[PDB]
C-alpha cells in the first residue's frame, strides 16, 4: 500500500505521510523535515 507524500492531503491524527514526515492541520497537507 502506497503512502502519502509531501504535497499530498492528510488529516491530523492519521499521519498517512511516510516515516519522517509531519502532518499540518492548518492547511491539511504533508510536511518534510528540512
Radius of gyration over every alpha carbon of the chain, rounded to an integer in angstroms:
8
Q: Please state, in angstroms and rounded to a whole number, the distance separating the CA atoms of residues 3 and 24.
A: 16
Method: NMR
| Three cell numbers written together for 9 | 492531503
Cell readout for 17 is 505521510
* CA nearest to 17, candidates 25, 26, 29: 29
3-state SS, the chain, equals CCCECCCCCCCCCCCCECCCEEEECCCCEEEECC
State the Cα angle at 16 between 30 and 13, rounded to 5°. Answer: 90
Measure the CA–CA gap between 21 and 5, rounded to whole angstroms.
8
Amino acid at each position: 500500500a502506497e503512502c502519502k507524500g509531501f504535497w499530498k492531503s492528510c488529516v491530523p491524527g492519521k499521519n498517512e505521510c511516510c516515516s519522517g514526515y509531519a502532518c499540518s492541520s492548518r492547511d491539511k497537507w504533508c510536511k518534510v523535515l528540512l
